[model samples]
Target: ESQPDPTPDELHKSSEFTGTMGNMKYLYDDHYVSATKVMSVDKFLAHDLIYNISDKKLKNYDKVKTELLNEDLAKKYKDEVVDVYGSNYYVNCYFSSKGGKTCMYGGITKHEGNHFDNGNLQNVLIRVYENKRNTISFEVQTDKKSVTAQELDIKARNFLINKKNLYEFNSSPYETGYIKFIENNGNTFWYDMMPAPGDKFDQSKYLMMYNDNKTVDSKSVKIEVHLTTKNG
Candidate 1:
């Protein structure tokens, strides 16, 4: 049987914010920000989401090409090779000017593992906004409709805590930005607790951030399987 398409509301949801901002302000359901111009994955290469080296449009073409052609390494790091080629990894963001909230979403549609198996390819949705005294807050969610709201929350929280996780923004190294875990209503959340940069509210920075699970175990296992086949 064919699955039904997702409704507009299913893809996104509207949110509301209130506080010293005074009257209740609502975030519009539409309006997205573009932050794709400058992005990179420095700290963790294998897991970072970057354009496949094969993409002719990528900047620093020679660097990526060299990485892919290095016979000694590319063969062992076949999964990374594939990702560096043409993967469906992407990040998106929407903002609520009235509510002062920015919603960021990231997902990996293609990889070297059983991406189509079960719910392996899940999309993450993170909403960042400010609270009293310019305190930043983050709410994490995912588009895995198959799981219950509670289960989805757990998965999102787990992804945030996993040490292997690394993210970056504005062509900055993965070391940039600060994330501190917090709890609310039994749900885990992260706060951008880093000292605010020159433009703390620069929505482009959040919208353009990149992240990767960088699970060496899964990637290594896949690479080994491919190596075995090649040898056989």
Candidate 2:
């Protein structure tokens, strides 16, 4: 006789544990746009085209595996002596109520005629490696500017502590308030890798613990400064 420690219904429910990982129709279902209109928006997005999303406000975006916009770019015309770069670039991503073949959008542009140069600060890639096995003690290496390594330690800490909420939505991680990072000493830093204290569901990839001898780098993160440009 089979034991029913887990009822038949319970076993059936546990089979599909995916928590809205992708197909999020409700998030963009509010807006309906023709495919051609969305395709038009794609032209601009083709530029640094960083951020693309559907939600207006971030409520439960962390549940998503990937968002519509991750890297949003901003700057002034070369004739423009703009004080900031990514700090002000926003193309205003719109949801199409229908997500299909591509990252479709229902929107327009700030300059329909003039082209934009892709001037961007080199992305601050934080590469972390693991040497200690059971403890998850780790260190980081990065392309340096003025920002210290310790600050990056905290920033990376938040990225994991906050459950990687920054990249889970349509908002730009480079956008205001979404920097999701901090500062410190030495070129590298260390810490005991621990899972987030709150969320019970993220035991697998939460704290970014690397394989005992492997290295992982986050190139998506930005340092936010002046670099160069790309025509879009």
lDDT (C-alpha, whole model) for all candidates: 0.24, 0.24
Deviation in Å, model 2, residue 47 alpha carbon = 35
The TM-score between candidate 2 and the true structure equals: 0.18
**Structural similarity to truth (TM-score) of each candidate:** 0.24, 0.18
> Which has the greatest TM-score?
1
Candidate 2 error regions (>4 Å): 1-53, 56-118, 132-232
Cand. 2 Cα-lDDT: 0.24
The RMSD (Cα, Å) of candidate 1 is 19.4
Error of 1 at 187 (Å): 13
**Residue 183 shift from truth in candidate 1, angstroms:** 12
Q: Candidate 2's residue-wise lDDT over 64-158, tens digit each?
A: 11121223322212122211101011122233333222222112222222122333232453332222112222333333223222234344444
